[PDB]
Design a binder for this molecule. Structure first.
Ligand SMILES: COC(=O)c1ccc(NC(=O)C(F)(F)F)cc1
Ligand SMILES: [Cl-]
Length: 115
């Protein structure tokens, strides 16, 4: 079901190495619905190439636009399994501290803060 489950550590590593060589200015992001989630829809895809200059506040806005949410639907975004300390951090900086050993940046969303 989940991305890590579908692809071998070997395959996730190689894909990240390709994105480096074909989309060098992009952060390779895995974005996934919380397995519990009842309310929000599933995304049309899993793997996103995010411009390395957008901050986390703008990435939340992008995903809310991609889910076509409305103003008063709740949305929470975990990064590397935990809460974002700050939405104003640039995704280039977030990547350098929160990336996985395979080289993706893993995110999970829900309507509840309690995942
Ligand atoms: C130079 O701009 C692009 O080609 C480009 C890159 C990524 C995305 N999409 C997202 O950030 C996503 F996936 F989170 F919605 C949209 C356009
Ligand atoms: Cl690029």
């Amino acid at each position: 079901k989940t991305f890590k489950q579908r692809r071998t550590f070997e395959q996730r590593v190689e894909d990240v190495r390709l994105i480096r060589e074909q989309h060098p200015t992009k952060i390779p992001v895995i974005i996934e619905r919380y397995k519990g989630e009842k309310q929000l829809p599933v995304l049309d895809k899993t793997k996103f190439l995010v411009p390395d200059h957008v901050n986390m506040s703008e990435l939340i806005k992008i995903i809310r636009r991609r889910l076509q949410l409305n103003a008063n639907q709740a949305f929470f975004l975990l990064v590397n399994g935990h809460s974002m300390v700050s939405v104003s951090t640039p995704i280039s900086e977030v990547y350098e501290s929160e990336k996985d050993e395979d080289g993706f940046l893993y995110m999970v969303y829900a309507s509840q803060e309690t995942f």
